Paper text:
To exert full kinase activity, MST1/2 and LATS1/2 requires coactivators, the scaffolding proteins Salvador homolog 1 (SAV1) and Mps One binder 1 ([name]), respectively. Phosphorylated [name] protein is switched ON to increase the binding affinity to LATS1/2 and this binding accelerates auto-phosphorylation of the activation loop, A-loop (also referred to as activation segment or T-loop), of LATS1/2 kinases for full activation. The phosphorylation of [name] occurs at two threonine residues, Thr12 and Thr35, located at the N-terminal extension out of the C-terminal globular MOB core domain, and is required for binding to LATS/NDR kinases. Here we report the results of structural and biochemical studies of full-length mouse [name] in the autoinhibited form and that of the MOB core domain bound to the NTR region of LATS1 (hereafter referred to as the [name]-LATS1 complex).
However, we successfully purified full-length [name] by low-temperature expression (see experimental procedures) and quick purification without degradation, and determined the three-dimensional structure at 2.2 Å resolution. The overall structure adopts a globular shape comprising the MOB core domain made of nine α-helices (H1-H9) with the N-terminal extension, which forms a β-strand (the SN strand, residues 5-9) at the N-terminal segment of FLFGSRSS (residues 3-10) and a newly formed 4-turn α-helix (residues 24-38, hereafter referred to as the Switch helix), whereas the 10-residue linker between the SN strand and the Switvch helix were poorly defined on the current map. Notablly, the SN strand forms a β-sheet with the S2 strand (residues 95-98). One zinc ion is coordinated by two cysteine (Cys79 and Cys84) and two histidine (His161 and His166) residues and linked to the H3-S1 loop and the C-terminal part of the H5 helix as found in the structures of other MOB proteins. The Switch helix-binding site on the MOB core domain is formed by helices H1, H2 and H7 and the H4-H5 loop, and is characterized by a conserved cluster of negative charges with nonpolar patches. This site is overlapped with the LATS1 binding surface found in the structures of the pMOB1A-LATS1 complex, the Mob2p-Cbk1p complex and our [name]-LATS1 complex, which are described below in detail, suggesting that the autoinhibition is caused by Switch helix binding, which structurally blocks LATS/NDR binding. Positively-charged His24 forms salt bridges with Glu51 and Glu55 and bifurcated hydrogen bonds to Glu51 to lock the Switch helix onto the MOB core domain. The phosphorylation residue of Switch helix (Thr35) is located at the edge of the interface with the MOB core domain and forms two hydrogen bonds to the helix main chains. Therefore, once phosphorylation occurs, phosphorylated Thr35 structurally inhibits binding of the Switch helix to the MOB core domain, which is consistent with previous reports that showed a critical role of Thr35 phosphorylation in LATS2 activation.
Residue numbers in the entry:
A (entry chain E), D (entry chain F): 3 to 10
B (entry chain A), C (entry chain C): 20 to 100, 106 to 211
The structure:
């Protein structure tokens, strides 16, 4: 299980 | 897939794209189980992007792609509650995670008579959101390997299929699609 | 199909039909083994017409179709070395025969490094000639079950794919296509 | 192995 984030 | 109706549904979905009207081809055939239709297409989008990423994986290395990028503006991270991954490390976690879901009998029952779980549309969304990123990283970072290998139409046509599909059944939000909304709108 | 390049070639072929330009989608990708490309598409046309015939097989019975018909003008027979069989008997022989070929390691090697036999284009032709007839019998004799089941676009788009494919690589002669040359030229 | 014929 992965918790994914994105950044700008 | 045992010559089952579910297998027919996959063949049905693939054949009907040849009309080139993807917007109609991706709709629920009348009287069909929604979950089943989404399931079948989710599985096929996975195999598709898997083979797609597979064609350029020699160009995607720890060196070439130190971070998980979608162009300069956009960068992804995994965590367990920030483990930074190279793109091929990130994508390995993503696809392994996705495979694992598809291999979970509680989520994608291999038995055609077993109903999908109550939250199935939710797991399908999460999967498809994540599969988007592999498309995004290919476009923004390896479109030239893709050109020289001549798997550009394959990538383009697979991605067009994916978008129309996912917009039809509300499987991906607008924020997720942002690193490719240029390419999208072009359609 | 093991995540092999051959499996990729199948996904490649299916995705690229979504452009709807079947005439280009069916051409040999540059540098690709001809035999392999034909093999992959032959196998998929078999699964396709198999699932297709499968949707209306309750409507195809010993009583409904006493002979192997392609409309009034055209009628097929099997013989060994003249055995009128009912359409479902004829089609069972045909598809079993075709399956058997695809299951023959000497003809369709399951091992990606093994060259196809010298006469491979010849066996592919014979198969595709025969697969035509199942399309022909469906159109001329069960198009109404097909309509009510809503597998008409599936049938039409599969058949359009098949024709363009087979014309591209010279796999079926003009005489064989005659019981459907109306529908054909229509697209 | 089948030998196939057609008529009209
Ligand atoms: Cl995520
Ligand atoms: Cl024959
Ligand atoms: Zn990369
Ligand atoms: Zn019949």
């Amino acid at each position: 299980f992965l918790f994914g984030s994105r950044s700008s």
